[PDB]
Amino acid sequence: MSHHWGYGKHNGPEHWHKDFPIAKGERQSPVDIDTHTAKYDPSLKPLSVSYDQATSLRILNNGHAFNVEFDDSQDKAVLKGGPLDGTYRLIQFHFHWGSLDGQGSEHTVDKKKYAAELHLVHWNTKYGDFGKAVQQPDGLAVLGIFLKVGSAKPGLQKVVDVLDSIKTKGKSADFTNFDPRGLLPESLDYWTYPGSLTTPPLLECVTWIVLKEPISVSSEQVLKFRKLNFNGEGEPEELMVDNWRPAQPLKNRQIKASFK
Numbered sequence: 001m002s003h004h005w006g007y008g009k010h011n012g013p014e015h016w017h018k019d020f021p022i023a024k025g026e027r028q029s030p031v032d033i034d035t036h037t038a039k040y041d042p043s044l045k046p047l048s049v050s051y052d053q054a055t056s057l058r059i060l061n062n063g064h065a066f067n068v069e070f071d072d073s074q075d076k077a078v079l080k081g082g083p084l085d086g087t088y089r090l091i092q093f094h095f096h097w098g099s100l101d102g103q104g105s106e107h108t109v110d111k112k113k114y115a116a117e118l119h120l121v122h123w124n125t126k127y128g129d130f131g132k133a134v135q136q137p138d139g140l141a142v143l144g145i146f147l148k149v150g151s152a153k154p155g156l157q158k159v160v161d162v163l164d165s166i167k168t169k170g171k172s173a174d175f176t177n178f179d180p181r182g183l184l185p186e187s188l189d190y191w192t193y194p195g196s197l198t199t200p201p202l203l204e205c206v207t208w209i210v211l212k213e214p215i216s217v218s219s220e221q222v223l224k225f226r227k228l229n230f231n232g233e234g235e236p237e238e239l240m241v242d243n244w245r246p247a248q249p250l251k252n253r254q255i256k257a258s259f260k
């Protein structure tokens with residue numbers, strides 16, 4: 001209730017370390033993915049994305065992004081396999097995006113920035129709840145998917161169409177019966193490394209799984225993201241754009257590839 005961090009010049013990524021010293025830690029996210037330096041790990045398993053029984057509930061503008069929230073009180077939408085041991089439940093997804101099509105992703109690929117990045121957030125069921133899981137080095141698994149501007153993503157349009165109803169911080173809307181399978185690319189080829197939340201509190205609790213294949217979204221879909229507001233209703237309008245953290249030092253980490 002006393003957090004003042006954001007993405008402005010006076011409260012953005014360069015300032016976060018003052019309230020969240022782990023910002024300068026040993027396993028911060030995002031990072032640049034050097035495709036030539038990532039090593040193929042033949043011991044890495046295919047990812048298992050099991051979203052058939054997903055139960056979406058609500059969409060919330062939290063003043064930093066918008067979250068599509070799921071029922072995570074049972075194994076309904078789970079991520080397993082790949083680098084993971086055990087079962088990770090989907091709790092929410094959100095995006096980071098830019099003011100311009102040439103920026104917006106948090107991870108980069110050979111220094112390339114995508115227009116946006118989708119984060120499907122999952123927590124390790126052996127820790128019982130999300131709040132306990134974020135305190136553990138293997139508490140979360142975030143599936144990251146890049147967005148490039150080209151053809152529309154049909155499975156994104158229900159998200160685009162509700163944004164008018166959650167323009168400002170603190171607004172929520174019913175968002176039942178949304179199928180997150182409609183946001184996945186064809187291939188589940190991925191890179192993986194140990195990292196952190198990319199927003200305060202920047203906890204070092206995430207196994208990152210970043211898909212190699214981007215999804216295409218239309219210019220009109222991402223334009224609607226950029227009409228959202230960071231501010232609350234009745235406050236001065238600040239467009240919700242450039243809500244990404246830049247790449248952080250890799251330090252003592254290796255990025256593993258599931259492919260080639």
Ligand SMILES: NS(=O)(=O)c1ccc(OP(=O)(O)c2ccccc2)cc1
Pocket residue numbers: 119121131134142196197198199200201
């Ligand atoms: N952008 S990312 O790395 O996917 C992320 C960031 C923060 C997240 O949790 P959060 O919902 O901000 C939270 C953290 C700690 C206590 C309560 C809530 C989840 C994913």
Ligand SMILES: [Zn+2]
Pocket residue numbers: 094095096119198
């Ligand atoms: Zn995120």
